[PDB]
Amino acid sequence: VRPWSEFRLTPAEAAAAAALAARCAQRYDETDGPEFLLDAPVIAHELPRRLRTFMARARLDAWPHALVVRGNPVDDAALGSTPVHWRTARTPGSRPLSFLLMLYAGLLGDVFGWATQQDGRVVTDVLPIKGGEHTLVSSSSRQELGWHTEDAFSPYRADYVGLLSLRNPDGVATTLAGVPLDDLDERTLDVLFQERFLIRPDDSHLQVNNSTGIAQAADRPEPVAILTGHRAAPHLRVDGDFSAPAEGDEEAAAALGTLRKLIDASLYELVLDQGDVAFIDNRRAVHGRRAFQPRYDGRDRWLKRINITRDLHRSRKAWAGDSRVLG
Numbered sequence: 555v556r557p558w559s560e561f562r563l564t565p566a567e568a569a570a571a572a573a574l575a576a577r578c579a580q581r582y583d584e585t586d587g588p589e590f591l592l593d594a595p596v597i598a599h600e601l602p603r604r605l606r607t608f609m610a611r612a613r614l615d616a617w618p619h620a621l622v623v624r625g626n627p628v629d630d631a632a633l634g635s636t637p638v639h640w641r642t643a644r645t646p647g648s649r650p651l652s653f654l655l656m657l658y659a660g661l662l663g664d665v666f667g668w669a670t671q672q673d674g675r676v677v678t679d680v681l682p683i684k685g686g687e688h689t690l691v692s693s694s695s696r697q698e699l700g701w702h703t704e705d706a707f708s709p710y711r712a713d714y715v716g717l718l719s720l721r722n723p724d725g726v727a728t729t730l731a732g733v734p735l736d737d738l739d740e741r742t743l744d745v746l747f748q749e750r751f752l753i754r755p756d757d758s759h760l761q762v763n764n765s766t767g768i769a770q771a772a773d774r775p776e777p778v779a780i781l782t783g784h785r786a787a788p789h790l791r792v793d794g795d796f797s798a799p800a801e802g803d804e805e806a807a808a809a810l811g812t813l814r815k816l817i818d819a820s821l822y823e824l825v826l827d828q829g830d831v832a833f834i835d836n837r838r839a840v841h842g843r844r845a846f847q848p849r850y851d852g853r854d855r856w857l858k859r860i861n862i863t864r865d866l867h868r869s870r871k872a873w874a875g876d877s878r879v880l881g
């Protein structure tokens with residue numbers, strides 16, 4: 555095999571991890587509180603050793619687009635109905651699973667949120683919101699969520715995007731694609747490495763997607779490269795919807811157009827069943843979500859998600875209130 559690295563917890567490992575998260579949910583008032591934010595990486599050292607070994611070695615592999623952990627138990631009855639909105643989605647039934655995601659994430663890096671996304675929460679919610687079916691945000695449904703680097707507009711975007719599937723009864727697939735190196739000619743590749751492209755911020759950073767900097771990003775975007783790093787294993791920064799060539803740059807336009815078609819043709823599906831966790835490498839792969847028909851009956855697809863950077867100090871310029879919410 556697969557383009558991702560997969561780990562399946564044994565029942566005993568899964569019980570121990572869940573018990574750990576339960577303990578944290580008893581001792582800490584909230585997942586995004588400063589106390590648990592600082593303690594979670596240390597508490598994570600108590601997770602099962604086989605899981606910690608996987609996370610430590612897999613993060614260092616050069617190939618995988620995602621780290622996938624399967625087999626966390628989720629009791630639908632204890633979980634309760636899927637919320638109608640992210641504002642009210644911190645339900646007691648989902649609380650321990652949110653702490654669990656935080657613990658797993660603490661093995662990979664430093665977690666943060668965005669002041670302009672779900673009220674600057676660190677653990678956020680992905681669920682279908684009635685009326686937002688044909689939008690370009692993660693609460694869409696009937697409209698396929700086009701592939702994208704998470705927060706491509708920003709130089710402080712996550713290195714990893716964590717997704718915990720609380721329920722996915724219809725098996726809706728997350729979509730993934732890597733750099734199509736096997737099909738890019740060297741000239742096209744060279745152009746993609748140059749600062750000849752524009753990236754606007756996606757709609758989830760707009761004021762209409764929050765309760766009661768981003769402006770200058772979609773209005774006066776600075777030219778940026780789509781590919782960086784090693785020619786033979788580039789890092790990727792693109793958004794299928796919000797990317798564009800520099801004004802009048804027909805050679806960059808042709809390179810982006812080619813890249814769109816190659817990623818479209820190489821997109822593959824990863825189904826996160828209930829309890830599955832995925833950490834998507836936001837530098838090697840773009841990700842999206844297949845279109846699906848929302849239910850609105852209380853059992854809709856529901857994910858918790860979290861942004862992870864290897865170095866919070868790389869984003870010092872963007873620290874808003876504290877270091878864990880970027881502006």
Ligand SMILES: NC(=[NH2+])NCCC[C@H](N)C(=O)O
Nearest residue numbers: 690691692700702756758795
């Ligand atoms: N090309 C795009 N649709 N980009 C935006 C992706 C959705 C974004 N990850 C969100 O949480 O809403």
Ligand SMILES: O=C(O)CCC(=O)C(=O)O
Nearest residue numbers: 680692715728841842843
């Ligand atoms: O809907 C999914 O499975 C992924 C959503 C997504 O792209 C995100 O919020 O990072």
Ligand SMILES: [Fe+3]
Nearest residue numbers: 702703704841
């Ligand atoms: Fe995304």
